[PDB]
């Protein structure tokens, strides 16, 4: 049941918004992290509830 | 118990009452509107959105607009919104940009560099005055120059003199030029920026005037400041051949160093300490009066002054009652204060190989022999008998 339920909704999961990889430069106290994405500028941005 | 009690009684009522006063005042602010204070918080988030894109402020246009350079390359004629001030933005400052329509929404950032930390120290020296074995008067000419106008500016305005700037600590090797600089660096507790003179020649050409001017910028912010320039001799004697600008380049670094030292800047209080081994090698403009007010000289210790150097250094040591401290001074003549510190260490080291904590008269004579052979003395005195 795990196999057939999984392949079927996996298609909607492959409508991905994408991802990026950065790296933590330093934190700030508004709960925000300065990240530098690798061939791009830095972003001051908030954490989810997953970290 | 009651000493704690009077402080408890003042501190509790004043502070807790104030805490209560804030709680009521958020609410009261809410009333003419319907929720002002708790909505200013929801607005700030909303205005800024997420993400905030960092840029570098390229130039500021006076009309509440700015040209910010995102490092991704399109430049933008942005507006300047709330939670920022336009004299808190200077060209070069980092700005926090609203993603949907670019706007300067702030900069709460630390904006600290590792480039400044190189200039700075993290410190608690082992060096304190009275680790100076004699030459007491010289301490109370240096302390009159560096340390004293921070303690009292009162003396210098009462007299009506301008407080002396700049010291040059020169003499021979082993007379503790670095040892004074650090003994006073501990006491003052003013931001003690350290920079060694050799780092002021680089491997590039033209980077010289740029590096030198960055020292004094850091120094200027953190006023009052000391800038200690250790062995500014090295740049005139040794050319390293790493600089493509050559002999020409080193000369130009000198010239920016002259303006940054006094000049037209009207910067903060910056005492400058300059250790050097020869003052006949440094550029005369560099050392000239009214930018280096006081020039202290050290020359070799005396028969009695060597006794002082020895007490301060043999004190840490474990000792025997066979140790005749006095015969180590009479045997040793025309040797530095550096040699006496190396002589205690060398005795202890022979004593660490024999596997005992005692330091005997024999480990001292053994050590005294070996340090005297290694010094190869002067040919300065080979003229003379
Ligand atoms: N007059 C002095 N009294 C006490 N200790 C001294 C004195 N002279 C030298 N010393 C000792 O010797 C050490 C080495 O000398 P230091 O490095 O301070 O010398 P310097 O004159 O700046 O020499 P160079 O330019 O050759 O480095 C000091 O850390 C201190 O322990
Ligand atoms: Mg030195």
Residue with CA at minimum distance from ligand 1 atom 26:
B173
Dihedrals phi, psi of B168, to nearest 5 degrees: -130, 125
- Structure-determination technique: cryo-EM
Q: Is B340 helix (H, G, I), strand (E, B) or coil?
A: helix
Assess whether the C-beta atom of B309 lies below 6 angstroms from ligand 1.
yes
Task: Say how many CA atoms lie within 13 Å of B252 toward its Cβ.
Answer: 15
Q: Is B108 an 8 Å CB contact of chain A?
A: yes
Contacts of B109 in chain A (CB under 8 A): 28
Residue with CA at minimum distance from ligand 1 atom 27:
B173
CA distances from B342 to B303, B307, B313, B338 (A): 18, 15, 10, 6
From the CA of B179, the nearest ligand is: 1
Which secondary-structure segment (H or E) carries B37? helix B37-48
Q: Is B53 an 8 Å CB contact of chain A?
A: yes
Instruction: State how far the Cα of B185 lies from the Cα of B226, in Å rounded to an integer.
Output: 8
Task: Say how many CA atoms lie within 13 Å of B332 toward its Cβ.
Answer: 33
Dihedrals phi, psi of B163, to nearest 5 degrees: -70, 130
CA distances from B30 to B35, B44, B320 (A): 4, 17, 80
Token pair for residue B54? 């960092």
**Listed residue (B122, B50, B47) closest to A31, CA to CA:** B50
Token pair for residue B152? 């009292």
State how far residue A45 is from chain B, nearest Cα, in angstroms: 5
Say if residues B302 and B340 touch (Cβ distance below 8 Å): no
């Amino acid at each position: 049941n795990d196999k057939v339920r999984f392949i079927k909704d996996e298609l909607r999961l492959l409508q991905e918004p994408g991802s990026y990889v950065g790296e933590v430069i330093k934190i700030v106290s508004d709960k925000k992290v300065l990240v530098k994405v690798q061939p791009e500028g830095k972003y001051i941005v908030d954490v989810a509830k997953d970290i | 118990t009651r000493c704690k009690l009077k402080l408890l009684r003042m501190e509790r009522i004043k502070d807790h009452l104030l805490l209560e006063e804030e709680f009521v005042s958020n609410s009261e602010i809410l009333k003419p509107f319907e929720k002002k204070q708790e909505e200013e918080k929801k607005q700030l988030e909303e205005i800024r959105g997420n993400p905030l894109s960092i840029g570098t402020l390229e130039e500021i246009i006076d009309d509440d607009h700015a040209i910010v350079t995102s490092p991704t390359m399109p430049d933008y004629y942005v507006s300047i919104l709330s939670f920022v001030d336009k004299e808190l933005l200077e060209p070069g400052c980092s700005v926090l940009l609203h993603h949907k329509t670019m706007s300067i929404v702030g900069v709460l950032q630390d904006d600290a560099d590792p480039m400044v930390s190189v200039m700075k120290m993290d410190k608690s020296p082992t060096e304190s005055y009275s680790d100076i074995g004699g030459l007491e008067s010289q301490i109370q000419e240096i302390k009159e120059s560096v340390e004293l106008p921070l303690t009292h500016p009162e003396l210098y305005e009462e007299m009506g003199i301008k407080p002396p700037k700049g010291v040059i600590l020169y003499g021979a090797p082993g007379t503790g030029k670095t040892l004074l600089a650090k003994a006073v660096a501990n006491q003052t507790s003013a931001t003690f920026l350290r920079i060694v003179g050799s780092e002021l020649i680089q491997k590039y050409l033209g980077d010289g005037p740029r590096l030198c001017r960055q020292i004094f910028k850091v120094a200027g912010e953190n006023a009052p400041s000391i800038v200690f320039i250790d062995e500014i001799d090295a740049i005139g004697t040794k050319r390293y051949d790493s600089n493509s600008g050559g002999e020409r380049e080193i000369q130009r670094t000198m010239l920016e160093l002259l303006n940054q030292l006094d000049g037209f800047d009207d910067r903060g209080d910056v005492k400058v300490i300059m250790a050097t081994n020869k003052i006949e090698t440094l550029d005369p403009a560099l050392i000239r009066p009214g930018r280096i007010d006081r020039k202290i000289l050290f020359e070799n210790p005396d028969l009695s002054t060597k006794k002082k150097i020895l007490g301060i250094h043999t004190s840490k040591m474990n000792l025997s009652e066979d140790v005749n401290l006095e015969t180590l001074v009479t045997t040793k003549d025309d040797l530095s204060g550096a040699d006496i510190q190396a002589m205690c260490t060398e005795a202890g080291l022979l004593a660490l190989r024999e596997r005992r904590m005692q330091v005997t008269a024999e480990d001292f004579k053994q050590a005294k022999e070996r340090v005297m052979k290694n010094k190869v003395e002067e040919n300065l005195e080979g003229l003379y008998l």
